[PDB]
Design a protein around this ligand. Structure first.
Ligand SMILES: Cc1cc2nc3c(=O)[nH]c(=O)nc-3n(C[C@H](O)[C@H](O)[C@H](O)COP(=O)(O)O)c2cc1C
Length: 356
């Protein structure tokens, strides 16, 4: 019944509308993963979103291989995030930090360590580094000490996000990164309690989520999953058997909201024949469900009207339409985004898309 323009509560976050800015890596931080001041303008321009989910933000150097992406493990990073978050709040916006461990999707020339994963696998193709593209290296399967350390890193990152002023966090459990590499049977070949049957494959997500919620509260914790379709070499052969139980687990843990990146056979940023799991997940996760990928404004309105989702997150539309909610409301045409400047440096194709 609520429309995209009606408010929604994501835990304690009182969002003014249900038009969410999806997480978008842009590479406008520095080589120490410290946010740069231009990022304050970028997010402030987009503060009419009901909720902004930040670009994926590294919880550690081990888990952050993306050149010029920000982190949130250090005091210097927290201090740099503070004015970015404050500028959004000054405009009445709300913003959560997407906490990232990239798992096998890193190169050791950026992280200084071998890529880590559920199993000793290699992502397909080549990886974007500071020196250009390099073939992926084989990851190492994390051990018990690694798991303990990575949980500490998630805890520290969640506390640091709150200390920077973020309204909450979203756990990046999607897109073939570390958690997703445990969830899906295409990448998880472990023989211990983290591998095999779906309950075991969910265990790493469970333990990460439990540690984050014990630090900042389940009501300030959201999660992103990407249940259907190969992303970055990560797929499950029967996604319904693991992603529906994962969503039920998140519901039981008290997770405040769940975002699903869902592909289709004609997808324009990833395509697949695996069907969307949102109808099944909607039955087991009962708090706000945010859907994402290839939504026209009309399709987004239909999804809320038919009770399929509580809110819709838009990625590429927010790149090029900082005033997306106002354009929707006023019937104004949308500016196309320039993929050439998605991941480049500086303001071009970043802060120079005008509002209408
Ligand atoms: C340039 C770019 C950066 C992205 N960065 C992230 C990211 O940091 N974290 C994430 O979970 N998804 C990321 N994605 C996936 C988007 O959040 C979103 O799922 C995708 O753009 C499809 O939604 P859309 O059709 O509304 O654009 C990114 C996508 C693009 C194109």
């Amino acid at each position: 019944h609520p429309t995209l323009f009606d408010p929604i509560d994501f835990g304690p976050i009182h969002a003014k509308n249900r038009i969410v800015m999806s997480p978008l890596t842009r590479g406008r931080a520095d080589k120490e993963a410290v946010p740069e001041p231009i990022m304050a303008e970028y997010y402030a321009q987009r503060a009419s979103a009901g909720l902004i989910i930040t670009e994926a933000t590294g919880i550690s150097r081990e888990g952050l291989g993306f050149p010029y992406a920000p982190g949130i493990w250090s005091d210097a990073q927290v201090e740099a995030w503070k004015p970015i978050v404050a500028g959004v709040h000054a405009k009445g916006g709300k913003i959560v930090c997407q906490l990232w461990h990239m798992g096998r999707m890193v190169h050791s020339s950026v992280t200084g360590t071998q890529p880590v994963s559920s199993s000793a696998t290699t992502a397909p193709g080549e990886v974007h580094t500071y020196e250009g593209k390099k073939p992926f290296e084989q990851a190492r399967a994390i051990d018990a000490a690694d798991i303990s350390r990575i949980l500490n890193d998630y805890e520290n990152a969640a506390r640091n996000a709150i200390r920077a002023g973020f309204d909450g966090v979203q756990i990046h459990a999607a897109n073939g990164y570390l958690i997703d590499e445990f969830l899906r049977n295409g990448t998880n070949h472990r023989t211990d309690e983290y591998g095999g049957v779906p309950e075991n494959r969910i265990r790493f997500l469970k333990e990460v989520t439990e540690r984050v919620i014990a630090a900042i509260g389940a009501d300030r914790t959201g999660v992103r999953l990407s249940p259907n379709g190969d992303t970055q070499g990560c797929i499950d052969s029967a996604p319904e058997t693991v992603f529906v139980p994962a969503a039920k687990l998140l519901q039981d843990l008290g997770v405040a909201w769940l975002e699903l990146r869902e592909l289709g056979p004609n997808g324009t940023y990833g395509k697949t024949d695996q069907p969307k799991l949102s109808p099944q997940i909607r039955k087991v996760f009962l708090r706000p469900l945010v859907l994402n990928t290839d939504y026209t404004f009309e399709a987004a309105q239909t999804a809320l009207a038919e009770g399929k989702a509580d809110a819709i997150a838009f990625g590429r539309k927010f790149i090029s339409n900082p005033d997306l909610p106002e354009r929707f409301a006023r019937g104004i045409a949308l500016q196309p985004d320039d993929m050439k400047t998605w991941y480049s440096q500086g303001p071009e194709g970043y802060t120079d898309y005008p509002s209408a």
